[PDB]
Amino acid sequence: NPYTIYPPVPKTASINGFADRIYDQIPKCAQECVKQSTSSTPCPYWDTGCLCVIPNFTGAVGNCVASKCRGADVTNFRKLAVGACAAAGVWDPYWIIPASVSSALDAAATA
């Protein structure tokens, strides 16, 4: 199987494979945002790497953070998302979001 070139991940989760990695560290404004349903993805719900690269999922999370978070909270959330996805073995830019969502996050961070 192609997934053994990546670091192993727990095959269960409390929320989901992305959220579980950062839930306790993210700014409080972003906590509701990472509880996004994984049901519209092809990802096992525990699969961090997959949930880092499916834009219908990351974009929803990103849209929510851009709406709910401002300033350094946006910046810190993105650093944590990138970090978790990078450690899961995802390629640069690690947390894979739509360009429109990135622009919205940029704006929220500079508000």
Smallest distance from its own copies to CB 75, Å: 8
Does residue 99 touch ligand HEB according to CB under 6 A?
yes
Residues 6+ apart with CB under 8 A from 108: 65, 66, 67, 69, 70, 71, 74
Rg (CA), the chain: 13
Q: Which residues are annotated as a binding site for heme?
A: 47
Q: Residue with the closest Cβ to ligand HEB?
A: 49
39 binds, among its own copies, Cl ion, ligand HEB, none (CB under 5 to 8 A by kind): none
Smallest distance from its own copies to CB 108, Å: 11
Instruction: Tell me which of 15, 31, 44, 55 binds its own copies, using CB under 8 A.
Output: 55
Cα–Cα distance between 26 and 24 in angstroms, integer? 6
**HSE-up of 21 (CA within 13 Å, CB side)?**
22
The residues in 75-94 that bind Cl ion, with binding defined as CB under 5 A, are 83
Count residues binding its own copies (CB under 8 A). 49
Cα–Cα distance between 74 and 54 in angstroms, integer? 20
